[PDB]
Amino acid sequence: FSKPFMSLGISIMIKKPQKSKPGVFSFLDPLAYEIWMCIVFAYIGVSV
Amino acid sequence: SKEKTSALSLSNVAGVFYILVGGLGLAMLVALIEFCYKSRA
């Protein structure tokens, strides 16, 4: 071998943690979409 | 260590809709039997 002309080391590569894309409907996330309908169909039902 | 980000399904709050409708029909039961007694008296 010759003289070391470039210094380096073993490091780690993972995929970069992606851009946090919430979506335009992120606030409706902790409840499933079924429940939001079942609220509204029961919202009309109680008011009827 | 592997815990998940889980939304509530409909099964989690399932009985609340049941006691909602049960509270509805009970009011349907009372709204009948309050008009009948005043129509008798």
DSSP annotation string for B15-32: HHHHHHHHHHHHHHHHHH
Experimental approach taken? cryo-EM
Q: How far is CA B36 from CA B13, B29, B39, B40, B41, in A?
A: 36, 11, 5, 6, 9
Chain A interface includes B35 (CB < 8 A): no
**Angle in degrees, CA A31, A37, A33, rounded to 5:** 35
- Contact (Cβ atoms closer than 8 angstroms) between residue B21 and residue A44: no
**Angle in degrees, CA B23, B24, B30, rounded to 5:** 90
Task: Nearest by CB to B13, from A29, A35, A46: name it.
Answer: A35
Indicate yes or no: CB of B24 within 8 angstroms of CB of A34: no
Chain B interface includes A25 (CB < 8 A): no
